[PDB]
């Protein structure tokens, strides 16, 4: 029973710097094709 991680619904992204602990970017993807 392997694990599967499937980002096929709204998800969050937090792009971070391990050096400074800065959050460079934060995102919610509700629709990758949203106008």
């Amino acid at each position: 029973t392997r694990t599967i991680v499937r980002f096929n619904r709204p998800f969050l992204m937090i792009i971070v710097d391990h050096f400074t602990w800065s959050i460079f970017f934060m995102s919610k993807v509700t629709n990758p094709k949203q106008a």
Partner: protein
Amino acid sequence: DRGLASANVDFAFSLYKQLVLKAPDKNVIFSPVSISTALAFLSLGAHNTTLTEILKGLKFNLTETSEAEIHQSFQHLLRTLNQSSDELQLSMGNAMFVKEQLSLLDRFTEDAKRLYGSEAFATDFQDSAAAKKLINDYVKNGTRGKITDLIKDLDSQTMMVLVNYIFFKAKWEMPFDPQDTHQSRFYLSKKKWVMVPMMSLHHLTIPYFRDEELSCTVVQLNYTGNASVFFILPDQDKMEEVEAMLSRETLARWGDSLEFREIGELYLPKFSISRDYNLNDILLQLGIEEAFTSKADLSGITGARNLAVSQVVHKAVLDVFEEGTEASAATAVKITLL
């Protein structure tokens, strides 16, 4: 550094919550560190209530830190972010565009160059189209063409614009193979989807945490270098519940709870999103009020109480693809006579 991280992360999530509140159905993409730096830059010139509202809005605990501590911390952050690196492209710049006739305290211009790396460009805002193009070209150059139209409108009576940009281009530690990318469903809701290029990786061992209390799964994907992404995948219809728990404390718990796990398959869309924001209402909800009013105190800039913020704007772009990630953003603070 320790207290700067904590304040900047608190600010990031507070900002996030207000953006979602303002537009609950929309993609979100922004750079917290860009906005924090642009407003810290602004606070260099603020006094009294205008000043403390900004520093407290940025989530700094003033019983534990001082103004000088904060600016020196941002100076050090900028130096660290702009260090040369062969692994990852990362840069942040600051600039100020001033009407030539405006008289500036030498202390302000010196501290701006020294602490925030800002030059002072003479700008004739009365020729608004040219002034607009110059600022937008500065941002376009800094973001390698990614942020093209940060300034949409520019009043002719503008006295000063403070600008921050950030540019980010990184390679995945474990990149996706484009031959494994196939059109697949992305569910906007339980019954509605769109078709997207779904990238995939197989048999990868990465930090992982199933958060049963919050009904979400957390994984960390690394870039080459010191950067990585926390991906948070709420169960179907649990996004708003996860969003309500977004905080420094929760991110710390997630970070301490990651354990390496073998993943059979990871599926991630290839996508590009962009958003631009008028942050005026957001910053007011966060307690930054006087800088916008006739009672604004920006006398650290000129020596007189003759300037007020009109608008703070922000634009960001996020591009995710098989080889890595490109993301950039810019923040502008528009300032008029009072």
